[PDB]
Amino acid sequence: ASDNTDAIERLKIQYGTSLVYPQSMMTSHVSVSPNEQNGRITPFNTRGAVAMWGDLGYELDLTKMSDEESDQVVKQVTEYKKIREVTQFGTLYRLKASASNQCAWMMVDSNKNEAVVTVVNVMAHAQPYCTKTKLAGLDPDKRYKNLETDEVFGGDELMHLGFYDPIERGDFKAKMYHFKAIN
Amino acid sequence: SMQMDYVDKDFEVITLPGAHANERRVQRENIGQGIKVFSSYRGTSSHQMNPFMALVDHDTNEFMGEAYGFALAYSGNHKFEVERDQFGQIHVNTGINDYNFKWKLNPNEEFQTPEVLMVYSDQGLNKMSQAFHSLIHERIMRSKFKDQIRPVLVNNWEATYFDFNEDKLKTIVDKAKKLGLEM
Amino acid sequence: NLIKFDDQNKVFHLHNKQISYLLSIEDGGTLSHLYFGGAVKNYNNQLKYPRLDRGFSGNLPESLDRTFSRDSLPKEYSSAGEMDFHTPATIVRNPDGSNALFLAYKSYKIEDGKPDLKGLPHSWTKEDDEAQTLIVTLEDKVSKLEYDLLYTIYRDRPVIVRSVQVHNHGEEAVYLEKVASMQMDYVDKDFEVITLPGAHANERRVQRENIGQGIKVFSSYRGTSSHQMNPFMALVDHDTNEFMGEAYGFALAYSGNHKFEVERDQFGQIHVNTGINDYNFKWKLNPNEEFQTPEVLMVYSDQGLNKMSQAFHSLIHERIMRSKFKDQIRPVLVNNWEATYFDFNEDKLKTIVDKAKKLGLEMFVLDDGWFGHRDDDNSSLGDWKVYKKKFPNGLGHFADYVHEQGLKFGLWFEPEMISYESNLYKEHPDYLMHVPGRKPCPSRNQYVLELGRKEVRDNIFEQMVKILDSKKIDYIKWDMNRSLSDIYESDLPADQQGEAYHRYVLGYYDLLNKLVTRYPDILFEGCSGGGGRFDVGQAYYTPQIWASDNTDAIERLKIQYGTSLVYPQSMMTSHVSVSPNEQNGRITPFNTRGAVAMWGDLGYELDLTKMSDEESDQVVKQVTEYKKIREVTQFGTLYRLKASASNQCAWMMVDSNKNEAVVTVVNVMAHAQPYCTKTKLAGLDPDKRYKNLETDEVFGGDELMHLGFYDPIERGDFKAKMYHFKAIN
Amino acid sequence: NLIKFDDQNKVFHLHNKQISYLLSIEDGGTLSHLYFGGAVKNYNNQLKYPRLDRGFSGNLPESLDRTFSRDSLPKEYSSAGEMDFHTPATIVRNPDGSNALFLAYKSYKIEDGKPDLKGLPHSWTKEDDEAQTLIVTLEDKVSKLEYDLLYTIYRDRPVIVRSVQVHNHGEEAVYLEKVASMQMDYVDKDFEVITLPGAHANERRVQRENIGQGIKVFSSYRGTSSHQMNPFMALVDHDTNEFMGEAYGFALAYSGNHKFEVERDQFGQIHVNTGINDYNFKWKLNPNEEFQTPEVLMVYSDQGLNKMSQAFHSLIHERIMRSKFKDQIRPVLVNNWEATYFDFNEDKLKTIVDKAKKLGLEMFVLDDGWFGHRDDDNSSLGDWKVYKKKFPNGLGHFADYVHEQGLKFGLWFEPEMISYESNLYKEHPDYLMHVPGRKPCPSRNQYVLELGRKEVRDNIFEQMVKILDSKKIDYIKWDMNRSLSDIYESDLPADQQGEAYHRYVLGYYDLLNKLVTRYPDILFEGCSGGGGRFDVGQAYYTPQIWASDNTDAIERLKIQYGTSLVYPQSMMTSHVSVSPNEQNGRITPFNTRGAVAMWGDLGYELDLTKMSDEESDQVVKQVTEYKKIREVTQFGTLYRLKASASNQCAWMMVDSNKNEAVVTVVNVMAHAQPYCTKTKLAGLDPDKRYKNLETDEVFGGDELMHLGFYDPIERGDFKAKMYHFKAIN
Ligand SMILES: [Pt+2]
Ligand SMILES: [Pt+2]
Ligand SMILES: [Pt+2]
Ligand SMILES: [Pt+2]
Ligand SMILES: [Pt+2]
Ligand SMILES: [Pt+2]
Ligand SMILES: [Pt+2]
Ligand SMILES: [Pt+2]
Ligand SMILES: [Pt+2]
Ligand SMILES: [Pt+2]
Ligand SMILES: [Pt+2]
Ligand SMILES: [Pt+2]
Ligand SMILES: [Pt+2]
Ligand SMILES: [Pt+2]
Ligand SMILES: [Pt+2]
Ligand SMILES: [Pt+2]
Ligand SMILES: [Pt+2]
Ligand SMILES: [Pt+2]
Ligand SMILES: [Pt+2]
Ligand SMILES: [Pt+2]
Ligand SMILES: [Pt+2]
Ligand SMILES: [Pt+2]
Ligand SMILES: [Pt+2]
């Protein structure tokens, strides 16, 4: 998609790219920090999450990685392998554009049984406004389990009430959600 | 490849300008009397202006409102022209850029233009993008891999640049295997 | 099953197939607002407000938990003295001189239907099964006050209705310096705000603003809902228009002083209050007494302003207006005001009546100047006896004549007012509202009556009964031509003078309710130098209102456009008037004055007498074609199509079965090199086929809505065209 | 001779070389606003308000002329009860219970200089000849109240200062329910309005809005001027910016509840009130008493916001600030708060003192935690005696140590506050502001003192004097860490509880004035959880104020930018803090934190003893360089060049001779593919030649202002660059 592999600048690039092109058609790699192209310092988790929008790769010297990072990779990859059928090939919905201070998107499988959501916060403030993220592409009448929390919400809930984004300190943070329809 | 003329439409136009390491930011403008030109002379479709354009209502967003999408199926010089004329009418051409273009058509020969994909959405940009995504993925892409999960790969470029040889790479291969990478 | 309480999570849920309203009981019994919008089947705590220690946002009494604060929480209500620094919903003055009130959740009840509001207009139910009302009770354990918060939801409307009732259960009196009808707090919403400001002869333009940090106030201190700012407000998404997007409408059912407050705070939250203006408001609530606020109508739309408006139209018309005339077609009338002013007599009237009958007009309204010695606006208000010089044989004689010609008869009154030069002021000087010892300010050289007092109200009521009891008046135009400036009620203790504004309105409601109740077969039309009192509370009594003294076709476009944002079109009257316009001097085609006056209930305000046979015929042609469409134009679903600012204003009405549509398209300025424009319709059935009754061509509803049709190119300014579509078989 | 009265047309004209302010006496002795802006030599009645009969705009008592109306006239002031429906400058409550007031011109005086305001901060003069005050008196003949409106114009400033004094010349008491310091009415002006909203750790972002019909309110109920809305407002043309276009600035010299009201009315006119907030304000004015309002500083700029800000900066610094330190270079100090919080004792501090000396710092300020038994923020407020366990040899021992190391010594107090866990509360529980019978609301787990009571103030004053009389304390940081929530003054009668808010501010000002006058050699730095009380009033007492608890380099950019809108940079303090930043987690270059902190009065707030050699020498460098430029940075004419939304924030200072300029440019976000940017300068002499002291290259003032220079392209977020130019010969 771009020689620019900064997590943050990639947000707008991948966002615009998604305007026309399916996400399976763009590739995104977790690169080093500070970023080689612009010098930005970003969380490893953020680089991962942004790079899971496209086809995930790694472009950095795996042998010069810290144990902390080696296992970060092992985690990212292992989790990506669980969700990539939905992230790579699901109906894509853009939720928030980076100018809002958040960029958020999500993928839903063809049956509306599975959805993967990502929310990225750009700038932090000493005194943050509360934000909600609302979803799209779900079935109003199905019931979805947050696989992390085990709590369950109707598709109508997730589309109308949405949920509070967790308030975190620090620039460039990401959070990811995986919902699955139950019986 | 096509021309389209609207009467009594107050559109804004969305394109995807950018640069190297800075591709495809969404841009959205008013359409004034005169000709707005989005194009490339670079012999490629280019970093600086993607061969795509959308016409939307002033109130259209990601979830609501009408949008016309135009995508040129061509990887060389393109020219998108958007003209509001003396009578308020909006006139749109798209095709191979005419800059240093002059094709000798001899008797009994033919000339085929690239085609342009036109998409109409009645409910926002997401829906529009989604029809491009579907058409591209299902009726344009011919790769046998198009419906296959893409491998989680490691590319050595930002890792070692030219500074590498075989043994250096093998060690990266070994770290890759341990991390769960596929390519 | 419209309203549920979850005693486990302490969440109240009002919902039907359209809307959901969610509120909860937070820490320290604080009533929190969770959500209002599209319906959801369930709630699972996801909107629980985030806990964060926010600098200078203080905490519950005795609490050690700094992460929870009534200054940051989104709430259903608020008061002074609770550690909250938004503009509070309610402010109470205690005997010790403090303004402290701390309301905590006490209990709730869920009832069928909705309770009546004493002394006040309100929406209602026909069948109890059609609505439920949640009443949450908050209390202050110390002063022992109890606030009842009412929430009504109808089964089939996207409407929540709110009001407040305050109860003093203590040993001593307390003063209410402010009690809002509702508060609503939003989180993470970026809204624009729509209001309808104006002036006399210039009512209710649509204004749309961004909301910045601070407090935006829209209000009236005039003692009336007013020409300057209608008691309406909507919060909308930046992208919302007539046809798409979120919109929240708020309509206060009150005719006095209102205050809408929209506040974005330090945390980007949006705080909204609405109720009686607290300007010079101070209600003495004695032990064991109660205070009921006017109610507010809340509409949620998920598809643009037209839909919002229509829900308001339907509610007002079906569940508020009580007039037996509300479902009945309104007479094409002629009013002698602009036509002759005070210049008239029983025999010149008869000539107007005669011309009216010939033009097919259905009613004749007699305007100002028939009573007292009313030869101009400098005397006689308060003397509601026939002016014999002008009706030698008495008014009943003249009314009989009108009825002979086959026309209904209408009469103008201004019962709230009094002139220095009147028999009333000579007999009862103290009936005139002033501050004892201060010369009151005149307005149109008249003054206001102390309607707060029963004896004043009784006097007017009996004068009017003397006129009306023989049932020769079929119609009353109740006018009101000045604001209140000298605020006092002479029979009240000094410490109750803060009750004068609200008492005036209550007294106005009492008197008006009496007359309307006593003469149910009289068509009441409200008036206040135009639409100076055009509100939902007025609808309850009078089914139609004179929209504006401005009768210019072109300026009525935005006045009527704006009015239709809240009020059904059958509630606004519009009259074909003379050109050049009396108010602004504009020159307009007679057909255009017609077309614009057919949006409201058609009438005429021009000297039928001095009229050529040549244009008399245009009037016959207008009246005739109006009788053809008026069932649809008056009561069909209304869709605004284009606003004046576009250089075109367009609107249409569609009947309930979507078989008939009437469309009007008015062009404002002509251009030497004009752009082609198209008009597309709305509210049709995609699968029906409609015949244009003028050309006989037939089009599908899908065609009429997607494709539209070209507006004909015409030379000249201020031009109109009408369309009539009927579904075929 | 700056003030003239033309007794022919009844017009007052205040003028100098820069500005004219015209007001007139209109029909019914109505004080009318004509004009404020660029100076004009004469006036010839060309702004007499047009007469027109406007519907529902009533007229003067006893008047027959309907074309004149206090409801449409642009005025210098207004009250409830005069047939005006704008929001009134003043509302009075009379014994009869009414809110009637009808002010009419009575008399005027002209004095040299300007009067001191009793109990209040205010602008003043050194020489009488530098100002004239016009005082116009208006009277209600019935209530016998007299309103004095003061207007002061300085000979050499684009400023008018207004305030009000109310006199009760009657027999009975009256209540002032609202009294604004000024009202200003514009005709045919399309303004936008700029204010400085914010929150704790997020003060004073610039905000700029359209003005719609209705009332926009910027205010505070917190008992302080507040974090959330600074008491300042500016009206500008749509096209006005930092360098061009007209701007009206309004700054209220008051540190309590303020209310700024901005109303566009039904006739397009813009109506502005400013003064003490009227929320729970009700002042009992007995016979023969007077009431003085704070004054408001009005500035007119014909050429952009910088020029406007510059006139505020000059006036505040030269004719408001009284500190003997106001013209003295401020010390480069280290404050231990973010360094150690409460976790410290004497020896820990001494080591910080030692590191300070080595780094070139000039002052050590001991922050919260040194007193009572203050181990955290849950106790001890009110106990202003040293905490033995931490300073076993007393506080003077430690102060002696700081002085022996060559540093000045500073000390933190929070004189207004009390904890439940204190000896003060155990000995005088009634000193705690609350409404008797109600548990008061905690904030940061503390409560407010009843500062309206002399005996309360005396107690704190005597406590602090014990400590300060040693003269070992060279500097005081006066903090104040919560808003007022429970409004009561236990010594006032019930009917006087509406005086609590304002009395508190009077008490505050009185206590502060006492201390500041008694210790003229102590540098006082104001603070209120950061910039929670950052106003022109405060400036009169404390020559510098801690701008914000937010010490992130990046967020401080917008905070300091907005602050600079009104306040001189020497009046705000900025400290280099740790990274990641304690308040928001942002990671910033050390150099960037320095550069941003050199905009205000430079300090350090981080554990100097835990610094890396790399950083120790960074500090040594910063301090050494700051000491070279601080005369220009602290006291030069300030010019803002770029606002952070551009992705750069840039500013600069120029000395009074235009011989020396210090410029700073900060880039927020980095991009892989950067656009080239130029920075152009301001405030230089076009004809002088300036040397870049870093590069030794020389450029004309014209060059630097017109060509500017390229900003260097750097990778990485949050970078700063600094320039120092000096005129050569
Ligand atoms: Pt993830
Ligand atoms: Pt930000
Ligand atoms: Pt949805
Ligand atoms: Pt939905
Ligand atoms: Pt839904
Ligand atoms: Pt839609
Ligand atoms: Pt739409
Ligand atoms: Pt929905
Ligand atoms: Pt929408
Ligand atoms: Pt035009
Ligand atoms: Pt339709
Ligand atoms: Pt349709
Ligand atoms: Pt359709
Ligand atoms: Pt017609
Ligand atoms: Pt000038
Ligand atoms: Pt200029
Ligand atoms: Pt200008
Ligand atoms: Pt520097
Ligand atoms: Pt950027
Ligand atoms: Pt940023
Ligand atoms: Pt310059
Ligand atoms: Pt210059
Ligand atoms: Pt120049």
UniProtKB/Swiss-Prot annotation, chain B:
Induction notes from the record: By raffinose.
Quaternary data: Homotetramer.
Function: Hydrolyzes the short-chain alpha-galactosaccharide raffinose.
Family note: Belongs to the glycosyl hydrolase 36 family.
The protein's name: Alpha-galactosidase Mel36A
Species assigned in the record: Lactobacillus acidophilus (strain ATCC 700396 / NCK56 / N2 / NCFM)
Species lineage: Bacteria, Bacillati, Bacillota, Bacilli, Lactobacillales
UniProtKB/Swiss-Prot annotation, chains C, D:
Name the UniProt record assigns to this protein: Alpha-galactosidase Mel36A
Swiss-Prot/TrEMBL induction comment: By raffinose.
Assembly notes: Homotetramer.
Function: Hydrolyzes the short-chain alpha-galactosaccharide raffinose.
Binding site for substrate: D367, D368, W412, R444, K477, W478, D479, M480, N481, C527, S528, G529, G530, D549
Pfam families: Glyco_hydro_36C, Glyco_hydro_36N, Melibiase
Active-site residue numbers: D479 (nucleophile), D549 (proton donor)
